[PDB]
Amino acid sequence: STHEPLEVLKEETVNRHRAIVSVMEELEAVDWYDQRVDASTDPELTAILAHNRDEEKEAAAMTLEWLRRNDAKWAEHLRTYLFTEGPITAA
Amino acid sequence: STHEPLEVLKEETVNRHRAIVSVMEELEAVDWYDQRVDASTDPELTAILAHNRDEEKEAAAMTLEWLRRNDAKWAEHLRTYLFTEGPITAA
Amino acid sequence: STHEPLEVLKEETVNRHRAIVSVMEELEAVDWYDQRVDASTDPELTAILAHNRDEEKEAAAMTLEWLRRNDAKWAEHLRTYLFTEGPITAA
Amino acid sequence: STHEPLEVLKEETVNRHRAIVSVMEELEAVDWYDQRVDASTDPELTAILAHNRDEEKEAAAMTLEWLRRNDAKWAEHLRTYLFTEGPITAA
Amino acid sequence: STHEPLEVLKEETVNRHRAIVSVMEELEAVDWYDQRVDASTDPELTAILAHNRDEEKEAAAMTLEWLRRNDAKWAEHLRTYLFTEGPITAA
Amino acid sequence: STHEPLEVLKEETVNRHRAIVSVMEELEAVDWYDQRVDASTDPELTAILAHNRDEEKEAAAMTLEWLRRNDAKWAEHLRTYLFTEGPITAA
Amino acid sequence: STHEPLEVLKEETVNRHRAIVSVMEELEAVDWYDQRVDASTDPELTAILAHNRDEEKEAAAMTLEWLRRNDAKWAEHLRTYLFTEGPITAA
Amino acid sequence: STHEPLEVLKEETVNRHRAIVSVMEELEAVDWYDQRVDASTDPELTAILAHNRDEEKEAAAMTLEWLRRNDAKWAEHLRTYLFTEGPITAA
Amino acid sequence: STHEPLEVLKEETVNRHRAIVSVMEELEAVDWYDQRVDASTDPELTAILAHNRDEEKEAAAMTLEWLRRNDAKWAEHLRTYLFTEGPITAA
Amino acid sequence: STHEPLEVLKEETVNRHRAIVSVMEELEAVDWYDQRVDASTDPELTAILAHNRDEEKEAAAMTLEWLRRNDAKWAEHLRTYLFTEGPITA
Ligand SMILES: [Ca+2]
Ligand SMILES: [Ca+2]
Ligand SMILES: [Ca+2]
Ligand SMILES: [Ca+2]
Ligand SMILES: [Ca+2]
Ligand SMILES: [Ca+2]
Ligand SMILES: [Ca+2]
Ligand SMILES: [Ca+2]
Ligand SMILES: [Ca+2]
Ligand SMILES: [Ca+2]
Ligand SMILES: [Ca+2]
Ligand SMILES: [Ca+2]
Ligand SMILES: [Ca+2]
Ligand SMILES: [Ca+2]
Ligand SMILES: [Ca+2]
Ligand SMILES: [Ca+2]
Ligand SMILES: [Ca+2]
Ligand SMILES: [Ca+2]
Ligand SMILES: [Ca+2]
Ligand SMILES: [Ca+2]
Ligand SMILES: [Ca+2]
Ligand SMILES: [Ca+2]
Ligand SMILES: [Ca+2]
Ligand SMILES: [Ca+2]
Ligand SMILES: [Ca+2]
Ligand SMILES: [Ca+2]
Ligand SMILES: [Ca+2]
């Protein structure tokens, strides 16, 4: 799953890889859950996909907080733009 | 791109799709850049990959903030875990 | 995301399609989370990966129960083997 | 098919990997068989695809029972929802 | 799933397509099961994978027989080489 | 290529793997040639694609015969259904 | 299978597409076969893979001649280098 | 890459692998270039893609000549069909 | 990430690999951003996608300059065609 | 080949898509060709792979120049860093 050999990567780089790829899979799942919620024709199934959808968002937030704590630039940029107002392209 | 036909998906659901898949590509690039930074043997190349790495994080934070503003659950869970202390699971 | 056109697939068949692909993605996440839990070197991250792992199983269990209720054969074969004793094969 | 090197994965973990991916491929086959049963224009082929479809369901139930016996959380969450008559999201 | 538009493909050609991809998925499962039977360290699981392996072969034989009946050259070449003594390259 | 390391797979299992993936590629080629035969608008090309199509069937039959000779269950199931009459789900 | 809509692709361009991708599948099969011929441990299987290998070469040659006849530049460049002597890097 | 381990493949065979995949990638590019030439709406871009298209054909011819020189059955079949008149299937 | 073993690739060859694949993902990202800018229905998101798009171009320009400095042929061909007028295909 | 429907994509955007994917496939080929030159054991084949490699760079330069002419900020950023001296991050 890593493009470079494990012998040359820093231990922190591999851990962030494990954390980043997790966020990717969680973000991807939220998108697919949400699409199937709109297209679903069974309300009982829609409730399940909607419930798991929101649980993926929670998992994404957790891993993102971990990235924020173990990466200086994630902390800088996340603090710059998240929980703000006005244009997002200037903060 | 979307698993379900666009004619049955909401307009805001497709916008979030565009935002989510973007963050995925942003996170993926951060992971790959960081790995190549560790394995690179050319100092001038390492500087470029490290610079673009941090700009990918910035782009991810921007697109992530947009999701927070256009989805209540994203706002709920991101507020719960981001910028906190103590165990990330105990919250 | 379907091999046959939706203009010819029954309504129930597409709903099961949405549920099955969800179980696959949830089962897939359980496998990958567990692998990272063993390989992770950061306890803080391992705690997150282990928590999200177990909630994905819950999502799989929920979506799988729906399949049991909307397909006579899923109900027959699941009831045959789930929560049995002795060899899984013959019994 | 694993993502982390086997040298760091516990033996008990690799076996669960073998079972999970099997369930995925079996669940996937059910989805594709069922679609091709609806779209097929030859009754003889329809009989075969429908027969093998149900045989994949049987295989999934078997492998899924093995997971129930060799993973605590699978048994906990499967017990909560499988073979229940009330609403799923409230169990 | 198909490469050419469905409007120019004969209805029979599409039925054979549905049969062929099924055989491919069946053959694929037989190989993967067998590889996992050798590597599995849990007998309970090895027994399950071995059972489903042989059940996939049966599904492959059925779907292949349908191809033999709906294609002149499948019947010609299969009857030439299946169930023969001596070198296969000579019959 | 394979899924488990070749140092735990028995010699015979890997040989069958080589045969199975070969058969899959022949079946894959037959399905694609036939589709291009129906959609092609150039007679000289259709003749070539149709000729190579039938040569793939012959290659598949040869490899299948080898599987029959080197696997007891392939021989059992192929003998049951190949070259039969009546509903295929009855033999 | 095509990248641009068929509405704008000339009839002849789509036919060459069918011919080119066929050669690719032919070339791929030759390579796959040759590799398995070296690694196979069963002479009977090796004989089959070697036989089908050379027939894949023939199919590639046939489809390639068709390309030469239906494209002036294929004819120009193929004639320059095929059946020549001396260092190939020399028009 | 390769399907069998490099340590069991003959140097002879790996070189042809490198040559075959190159022809594959060049053939693929010729098809993609030709499609974009038909769909392009900018004459300047169409001229460039058409120019590179013909240069990919030349690269394929060179690599093919190398295959013809380092494989007897390539030399036999390429001579049978290339630069011939009359039906291709009867040559 | 590479096709040939790393122990046979020259050092400068692996660095250029890291640089080339980086440009690929950036070029890919520029295209995807632009497509979403056209399809987006939310002006706030469109501003973000447009902002990151142009910053991806800057990252590509940086990496390309590095390739120009670490490869004599990139420098030769880039100097021939970049920042020119008249028919590109001429020079 | 596109992710969004062609009816919402502007004409000029689809053309840049066609040009970008070409540069992508050409850059990929340069990398793959180069790896096979280092690992090849046949001098004749190496000469061919090395020859096509450098012409693939030429194809990339041509297509890349077209992007520079049909996209303002490609021209701006390429003008900033290409044919420069000293650190690139500056
Ligand atoms: Ca996933
Ligand atoms: Ca989930
Ligand atoms: Ca939770
Ligand atoms: Ca999750
Ligand atoms: Ca920035
Ligand atoms: Ca970016
Ligand atoms: Ca939960
Ligand atoms: Ca499968
Ligand atoms: Ca089956
Ligand atoms: Ca059974
Ligand atoms: Ca099965
Ligand atoms: Ca009850
Ligand atoms: Ca049965
Ligand atoms: Ca193939
Ligand atoms: Ca023959
Ligand atoms: Ca073949
Ligand atoms: Ca050998
Ligand atoms: Ca032949
Ligand atoms: Ca063939
Ligand atoms: Ca390519
Ligand atoms: Ca090329
Ligand atoms: Ca030339
Ligand atoms: Ca990407
Ligand atoms: Ca970047
Ligand atoms: Ca910048
Ligand atoms: Ca090119
Ligand atoms: Ca030239």
Numbering used by the authors:
A (entry chain G), B (entry chain H), C (entry chain I), D (entry chain J), E (entry chain A), F (entry chain B), ...: 7 to 97
J (entry chain E): 7 to 96
Please give me the paper's original passages concerning this structure.
Through site-directed mutagenesis we show that the conserved glutamic acid and histidine residues in the FOC influence protein assembly and activity.
While EncFtn does not store iron itself, its association with the encapsulin nanocage suggests that mineralization occurs within the cavity of the encapsulin shell (McHugh et al., 2014).
